[PDB]
Design a protein around this ligand. Structure first.
Ligand SMILES: Nc1ncnc2c1ncn2[C@@H]1O[C@H](COP(=O)(O)OP(=O)(O)OP(=O)(O)O)[C@@H](O)[C@H]1O
Ligand SMILES: Nc1ncnc2c1ncn2[C@@H]1O[C@H](COP(=O)(O)OP(=O)(O)OP(=O)(O)O)[C@@H](O)[C@H]1O
Ligand SMILES: [Mg+2]
Ligand SMILES: [Mg+2]
Lengths: 630, 131, 209, 638
């Protein structure tokens, strides 16, 4: 009438060309697809034999055989599966977007322990990405042996086969294109096998014309076995080690291993491994992030750890094998990447749990920490949500410790009943800060400090603003609060007045070298010291940031913290200077001494020296005076 | 042939949905909070709707018992008719609570997927290779 | 030898910026940029339904490149560590009337807050300063104007109508170097009635910025 | 046996679901594909009307309009293109893997200047990613108006003219899914079309409910928005370079990226080979604050095919050190896959990259002529240049000529190494340079004292990255580069003065020995060098390993604690100035008593101050200062 109805059509003449040109990118995957199908058929047999064992009379062995033939430049794949009937060849094999694997699985809705892949029904045609012509020969138990021949030219032919018999299953003959002979190479084949079929449940063999140049049955082609598929409670450590070594190729086994599985809309099993040693290229900027690989039904999909895991955890090796994901028409890519983010979140949670339990094992935790603490610290810097958890894993050297590190919580347990903050000091070395004037008074007060000797600690401590309700404070910054005896406080104020004009004089001398001159009881054995304002870079931060190749120099305008000169009233030098100021505040020699003291302090306080030459020149002059040179 | 089941996954730490003028260090945490609050409010709503449904269910159930008693009562049929109307109202109320619960079911169906709904901790087993 | 990078986080608090900033008359053009940096951020935040009526000057980060970054989205996820004992009691010259009226968060609430901040930026000094919420409004009203109980929100905890009416004081002349167009945008943001204010998108897309 | 012949079959019911469910990952391609088709239809008219003006009797204006309808939850795409016949709806539109673009591909033998976008005959069905139902109403001039209709339920229908005047092109009606309402939002629409229809030859407009003042006019604003602006930026590279001027070209740049200032420099690049393409390369006047934030995905160079955005993978398109050049690469000859989200055969991009790099270097060479702006360029991106030199060994031949440094003769003016070379003394067979923390440091270093006395020019280097550059750049214009901080600084000099130095070595022979003993495990070897003038001595680096500056950088910057390398690289010696008064005295003091600890302590002092002057951090700075304090107390009588 006013409307006509038509079924959708499909121009196979071009559809086919899309399939073998635009649907795929990589071409070596043709083996993946053929092998995948082979394993499906082997599972079909297995299932069927559960109901009728006599179906195995025509073959009791399940395997896949790869036989290259350079003499013809072809590749033969022998699949010992069920095989296809004449009808199946013309109904399934020759039909686009349709597979009997799906149909078989529909039959399996009655109940089965079968895990098959192949919901698209097109993968077969990927063979024409590499091969010029494909011949499929098969023998079903309920039918005769037939040959199926096509070059993908819009048609195919079928004829009963003759000569060599097939017990069951099918053979695929790849008349490889002339420029695709690279796939006849052992190495190339093995490369692809390792790339996409390491965990195929059935044995896959590779036949090579070797010593006598005869086809040698490489049975070990995919000898690696799945572990996460097994029951965790029945798996030994020895077995985990074997897997790990096989996975990573590291002659030394893992430090720790953990199972993880989830159930529901998302379902998967995973193995994560903590290595005993860090890799020499652990932080290489361009290193392929493939420490943890993603599999679906034990088929390699991708290894993009850039999204799958946090960068600070990018050392853990492992395998994630899911049951059902929304894969693209090209199985190389997964749709809805947010899924990977979900998976990531779950991975992180379990890694942190593992670390916690590893921490319980002190003897091995210290080994872990030694090797990977940088990553934990990186996490403090990078991850704003798990920082707290990560902070429990931190370990530092402290005043009351020897060469053994201690946690912040342990520090807290040793805090004084009037102590409200965590005292610490950063620097280049343990000895450096151990001998720093900044911790001398602190030690006199019976306080413990935290020593931070890695350059990355400046980034870490930046985020560690509070721990277990306790604040943190650097002894190198202005405003260091230590126990204040009221009697002392009075004496300090008296001292401030005593050295008031002295400080003013020093400031006049070094007006453009120091922001403020004042006394402070933070010092013990030093006459003075340069401290950093709470705002801006510390001496250590400054030094480190000024060693950054890609740093923007203009950022210093927001980070050049002010310098203040601390004075220690108890030194003979300081007292002498006071007396000398009284004698003559304009005494040049005294002024020169003041400058000397400053530069000496500045340098020894860990700050950049404006001119090492000039400083040393003054020294040389003093040396000459001692020598009587001039 | 149908992956629509995964077209609505909400990830609170989705680093691909950020902004130059926003500090994601706290933004991600805001998202977390919002999600939690949404789950809380949702659950409260569901529980209150279920409570109301069950209350009206019991009320009309007791009225139905009484309807039988009033029918039996010698002249209680006058009160019966009054109660029948009241019982119908209680049933209609129950129904509307159920209709709201049906809307809650719709909300569940429309609910974005997350780490608390996509899956549960089916299995976990650690092991340290000590020795 | 391998190559790897690491970067420093910026802690340049707006408050610190303003402490380092010059006297009343802070370069309007610089502020125009900072305004649109802020408002652009808001559009994102409004698109993501981000609720944060507790956002104050100190929750605004000003980077070394002049970029406004927003953080700390409401009390629900902030101050989990040592904080102020008077986060609310402190003079709330940077909180919208709707905060002072004890209502809720909205686009106009957010913008009212920063509107005063924008004026603070020009002055290098808090636009308003009252004691209680009603007193804070008593200072706010001196700039934006005030009506009786006929232009007040429904959800008001303050004695609406007990606020003696008065005129506005041309924001252009009150706030240093406040170009008229900005004075209009600000006055709109400062306007008492939240429905007479301008959205972040509208202000962002205004030719003033 | 008997050979039976069969044609291939296809299970369309499943195939259709594969098209929708598995071919695409990003639903934003929804509008892209719809728009792309519209533009093809418009090109069909252009050609037909070009050769036959009467083809436009039923309409001349060519454009693409998008009208959203929230009240229905539907979208309307108005294609003013050539339209389709009933037969075409049945044949083309209703068939998978069928496209009339190939009809024009073959038909247009005369239409060599016509270029249709893509050719798969599948993309249409991607509408169902977000749409529940699609209706297409069209009227080709050679037929009547028909309404194609389907919900992708295995079939489709065609209806007769319903009276809605459509005399050209087609109306695509999209019934959106309950959960796809985001595409009814202005913002969202703009976000998508901005990334996909950016360079459509025909203008795309939106018809949006205009945000307006309440219609109480008292006030009132316009009811609807005509968003023609979507195509305000036109293709530039498509025009002839010689006919392109900055008055328009610069506008493109500021539109290319949100930057309200003209570019620093540009280079049009035309390739007429197998990989025919054109490209515009832009250099910003200022580097971005996130320039080295390599955690962020790159997007400076974008790849378009037939003026349609495909990729932005700078990782392959360019080398990292050129990751500041922004631009457009546009080819019409590329083998994109079925999704059109990725180019097949990445080897293509490898070739393209090489060609791009070549021209980038040519641009830099062109800039070198404009001293003023070159300076500006150099300063803004000197790090990138230097990174390239470090990494890209192949192009060092060109990159090394772009280097510019301050020297002892040029002072405040930064100059070229080639200029250095052109002014080298007839004995100056090598390039002398020094690295350090800052200009004034190395400018007053003891290392450059004698060098200046010999009339030689010193290249001053100050960045950490400079310290990396010298680890790779060994020679320039045939002459090697020599650091004055390393031992064995063979400056050109009078042999007789060398003899005087050997005589001095004998004079201070015992002194050096003693000092070595004093500084056992502090310095590897104590000796004499005339590179020094005012200093009594100097800590120097070996011929290999890390320099004091290099250690400063590596030990602080590296995230890897490679203590093995630190160990191996930590080398240093002590040179003595035989003419210095202190040194002269030390000799005399050693002669008087080599066991005089006070002298020994003096030597130690000198050593530690020598480390300081050479940039070596002390193992215990506190004890250094303690000694100083002791000397102070001595002078003060304390
Ligand atoms: N070794 C085999 N034994 C029996 N039948 C096979 C074998 N290999 C392939 N087939 C048949 O080939 C047909 C075509 O399916 P094909 O493998 O192309 O789709 P699929 O690979 O299952 O789906 P996908 O494209 O997702 O891998 C199937 O119906 C299957 O029966
Ligand atoms: N708006 C339109 N106007 C005219 N023809 C159209 C329109 N949309 C679709 N078509 C028909 O669809 C055919 C091809 O469209 P489709 O996009 O599906 O394939 P393609 O554009 O050639 O390449 P791709 O499939 O990658 O988009 C065109 O030749 C035309 O017959
Ligand atoms: Mg298969
Ligand atoms: Mg198209």
């Amino acid at each position: 009438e006013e409307v006509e109805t038509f079924a959708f059509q499909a121009e196979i003449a071009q559809l086919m060309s899309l399939i073998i040109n635009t649907f795929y990118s990589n071409k070596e995957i043709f083996l993946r697809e053929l092998i995948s199908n082979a394993s499906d058929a082997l599972d079909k047999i297995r299932y069927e034999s559960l109901t009728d064992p006599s179906k195995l009379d025509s073959g009791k062995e399940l395997k896949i055989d790869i036989i290259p033939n350079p003499q013809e430049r072809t590749l033969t794949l022998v699949d010992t599966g069920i095989g296809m009937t004449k009808a199946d060849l013309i109904n399934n094999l020759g039909t686009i977007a349709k597979s009997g694997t799906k149909a078989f699985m529909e039959a399996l809705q009655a109940g089965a322990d079968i895990s098959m892949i192949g919901q698209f029904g097109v993968g077969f045609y990927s063979a024409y990405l590499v091969a010029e012509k494909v011949v499929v020969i098969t023998k079903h138990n309920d039918d005769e042996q037939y040959a199926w021949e096509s070059s993908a030219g819009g048609s195919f032919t079928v004829r009963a086969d003759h000569g060599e018999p097939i017990g069951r299953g099918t053979k695929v003959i790849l008349h490889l294109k002339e420029d695709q002979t690279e796939y006849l190479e052992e190495r190339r084949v093995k490369e692809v096998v390792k790339k996409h079929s390491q965990f195929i449940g059935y044995p896959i063999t590779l036949y090579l014309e070797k010593e006598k140049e005869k086809y040698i049955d490489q049975e070990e082609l995919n000898k690696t076995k799945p572990i996460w598929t097994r029951n965790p409670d029945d798996i030994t450590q020895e077995e985990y080690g074997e897997f790990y070594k096989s996975l990573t190729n590291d002659w030394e086994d893992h430090l720790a291993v953990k199972h993880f599985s989830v159930e529901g809309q998302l379902e998967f099993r995973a193995l994560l491994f903590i290595p005993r040693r860090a890799p020499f290229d652990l932080f290489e900027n361009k290193k392929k992030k493939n420490n943890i690989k993603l599999y679906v039904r034990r088929v390699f999909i991708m290894d993009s750890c850039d999204e799958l895991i946090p960068e600070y955890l990018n050392f853990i090796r492992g395998v994630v094998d899911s049951e059902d994901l929304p894969l693209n028409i090209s199985r190389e890519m997964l749709q809805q990447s947010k899924i990977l983010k979900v998976i990531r979140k779950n991975i992180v949670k379990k890694c942190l749990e593992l670390f916690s339990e590893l921490a319980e094992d002190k003897e091995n935790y210290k080994k872990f920490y030694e090797a990977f603490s940088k990553n934990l610290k990186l996490g403090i810097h990078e991850d704003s949500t798990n920082r707290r958890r990560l902070s429990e894993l931190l370990r530092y050297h402290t005043s009351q410790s020897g060469d053994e590190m201690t946690s912040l919580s342990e520090y807290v347990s040793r805090m004084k009943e009037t102590q409200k903050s965590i005292y610490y000091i950063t620097g280049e070395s343990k000895e450096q800060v151990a001998n720093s004037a900044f911790v001398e008074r602190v030690r006199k007060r019976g306080f413990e400090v935290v020593y931070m000797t890695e350059p990355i600690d400046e980034y870490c401590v930046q985020q560690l603003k509070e721990f277990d309700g306790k604040s943190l404070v650097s002894v190198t910054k202005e405003g260091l609060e230590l126990p204040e005896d009221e009697e002392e406080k009075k004496k300090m104020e008296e001292s401030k007045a005593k050295f008031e004009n002295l400080c003013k004089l020093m400031k006049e001398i070094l007006d453009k070298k120091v922001e403020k001159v004042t006394i402070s009881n933070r010092l013990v054995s030093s006459p003075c010291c340069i401290v950093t304002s709470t705002y801006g870079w510390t001496a250590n931060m400054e030094r480190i940031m000024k060693a950054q190749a890609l740093r923007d120099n203009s950022t210093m305008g927001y980070m050049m913290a002010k310098k203040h000169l601390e004075i220690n009233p108890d030194h003979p030098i300081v007292e002498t200077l006071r007396q000398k100021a009284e004698a003559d505040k304009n005494d040049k020699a005294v002024k020169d001494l003041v400058v000397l003291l400053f530069e000496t302090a500045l340098l020894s306080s860990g700050f950049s020296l404006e001119d090492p030459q000039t400083h040393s020149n003054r020294i040389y002059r003093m040396i000459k005076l001692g020598l009587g040179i001039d | 042939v149908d992956y629509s089941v995964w077209d609505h996954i909400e990830v609170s730490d989705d680093e691909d949905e950020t902004h130059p003028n926003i500090d994601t260090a706290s933004l991600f945490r805001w998202r977390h909070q919002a999600r939690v609050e949404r789950m809380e409010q949702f659950q409260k709503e569901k529980e209150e709707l279920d409570r109301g449904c069950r209350e009206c269910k019991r009320k009309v159930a007791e009225c139905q018992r009484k309807l039988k008693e009033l029918e039996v009562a010698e002249g209680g049929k006058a009160e019966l008719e009054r109660l029948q109307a009241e019982a119908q109202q209680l049933r209609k109320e129950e129904r509307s609570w159920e209709q709201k619960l049906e809307e809650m079911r719709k909300k569940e169906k429309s609910m974005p997927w997350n780490v608390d709904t996509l899956s549960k901790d089916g299995f976990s087993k650690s092991m340290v290779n000590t020795k | 030898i391998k190559v790897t990078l690491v970067f420093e986080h910026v802690d340049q608090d707006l408050r610190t910026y303003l402490d380092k900033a010059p006297p009343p008359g802070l370069p309007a053009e610089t502020i125009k940029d900072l305004m649109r940096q802020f408002l652009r951020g808001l559009d994102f935040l409004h698109a993501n339904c981000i609720v944060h009526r507790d956002l104050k000057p100190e929750n605004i980060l000003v980077t070394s490149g002049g970029t406004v970054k927003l953080a700390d989205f409401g009390l629900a996820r902030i101050y989990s560590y040592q904080m102020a004992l008077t986060p609310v009691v402190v003079t709330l010259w940077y909180r919208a009337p709707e905060v002072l009226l004890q209502s809720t968060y909205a686009t106009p609430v957010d913008m009212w807050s920063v509107g005063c901040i924008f004026a603070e930026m020009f002055r290098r000094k808090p636009l308003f300063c009252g004691n209680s919420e009603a007193d804070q409004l008593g200072k706010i009203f001196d700039l934006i104007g005030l009506p009786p109980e006929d232009d007040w929100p429904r959800d008001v905890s303050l004695p609406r109508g007990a606020f003696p009416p008065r005129g506005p004081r041309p924001v252009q002349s009150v706030v240093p170097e406040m170009e008229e167009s900005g004075a209009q945008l600000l006055l709109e943001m400062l306007t008492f009635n939240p429905h007479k204010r301008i959205s972040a998108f509208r202000a962002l897309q205004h030719s003033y910025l």
